Symmetry: D2
Subunit: 80 residues, 4 copies
């Protein structure tokens, strides 16, 4: 209900756990059927918006697994 990070099976879970560390919050596998309606900030890591809940707040993703990870690190480093 404050922050949640969602990811799909595979390399993107890696990036998601780094984001979850910085935000001090939980992660969730997108394959798990879940009620996102009461989560304040829903972050998605990797892929496209259509894969995720319509309650998504922020998508962090690049062209590859490596650039998705770079995008997360950029996001983490530039938080104020």
């Amino acid at each position: 209900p404050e922050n949640l990070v969602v990811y799909n099976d595979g390399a993107d879970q890696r990036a998601a756990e780094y984001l979850a560390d910085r935000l001090a919050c939980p992660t969730i596998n997108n394959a798990r059927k879940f009620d996102y309606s009461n989560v304040k900030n829903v972050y998605a890591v990797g892929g496209n918006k259509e894969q995720y809940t319509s309650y998504l707040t922020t998508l962090i993703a690049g062209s590859t697994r490596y650039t998705t990870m770079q995008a997360v690190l950029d996001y983490i480093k530039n938080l104020k």
Copy 2:
């Protein structure tokens, strides 16, 4: 606010993700400072109760990483 699974760095994350799959819920690393007061069911996987929040509901843990995993599988298999 329904279910959350907490784990410590290492092998226990493995067991936690299996439990989170069965419960269709998020996981959280115990190193992340987090407010557990509004979570209905807090599950902890591995270790002892003193490592975790006082809002803990269910600890699933054995003597080793392998028996902790066995305990989680037992828990999953026997849910009705």
Copy 3:
């Protein structure tokens, strides 16, 4: 060249890391193009044999992610 554990993206990596702990060996993601010809024992965790190298020695897999994990634990517990 003694032991190697191979897995596919997702839950099966979890089981593979438990097996790799017991065998004190490396793991490899099956998506990585790799030369298996010089590995003495090739273990695969989850799925079917057709997914993996023809140098496969032992497949440990069940009907589900949970029973694949059970099969690995059985294998670990019963080693002499």
Copy 4:
């Protein structure tokens, strides 16, 4: 015997798996007692050299989990 990536429990495994993807090779947990003498290139991700085998070839590590990950991405991106 060509490439192997070693890591310690925790966040550094994340970076190690990205490196292993790029190099198409296995990963190994540093807690596993292992014979590194016949591996051509031994990569370590995170921490200091004293934690790892003396057969280590390349250490990729920063001041934090996040900068260790950045260092791996830099390494991956700049390979020719």
